[PDB]
């Protein structure tokens, strides 16, 4: 089952779950076969333990992660846009993504697309 409901809320718990530094709690978002693609190194993690991978690495950091507008969430997808703020060469760091969601009948996200460029990186 996947409702527009279902899939806002699975948006906050990531959200939720980046700030908390939760790495099962992201993971447990995804199917199995989900796969994960980054635009920044064009890389596509598949499978539970590419993706756990990738988000261990990317929580090696602190992040202050919130959505800065409504979810956008319809049949089996849903997009948000958000801020990441860390710490970074020193200095403190926004970073101003868009991300895609598609999700499996059974309300997991099997595909997800993050997408930021050069310009939607800020000083804090
Ligand atoms: C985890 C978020 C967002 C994930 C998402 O898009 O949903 C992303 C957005 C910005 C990303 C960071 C920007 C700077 C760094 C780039 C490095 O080469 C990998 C580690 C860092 C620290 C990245 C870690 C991580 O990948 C962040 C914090």
């Avoid at 906050?12 to 980054?38: C, K, P, S, W």
Wanted: hydrophobic residues 45%; aromatic residues 10%.
């Amino acid at each position: 089952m996947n409702t527009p409901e279902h899939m806002t809320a699975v948006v906050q718990r990531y959200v939720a779950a980046l700030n908390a530094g939760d790495l099962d709690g992201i993971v447990a978002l995804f199917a199995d076969d989900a796969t994960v693609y980054e635009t920044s190194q064009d890389r596509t993690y598949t499978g539970t333990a590419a993706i756990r991978e990738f988000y261990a690495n990317s929580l090696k950091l602190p992040l202050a992660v919130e959505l800065t507008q409504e979810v956008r969430a319809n049949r089996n997808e849903a997009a948000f846009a958000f801020t990441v703020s860390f710490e970074y060469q020193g200095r403190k760091t926004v970073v101003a993504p868009i991300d895609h969601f598609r999700f499996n009948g059974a309300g997991k996200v099997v595909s997800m697309r993050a997408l930021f460029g050069e310009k939607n990186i800020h000083a804090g």
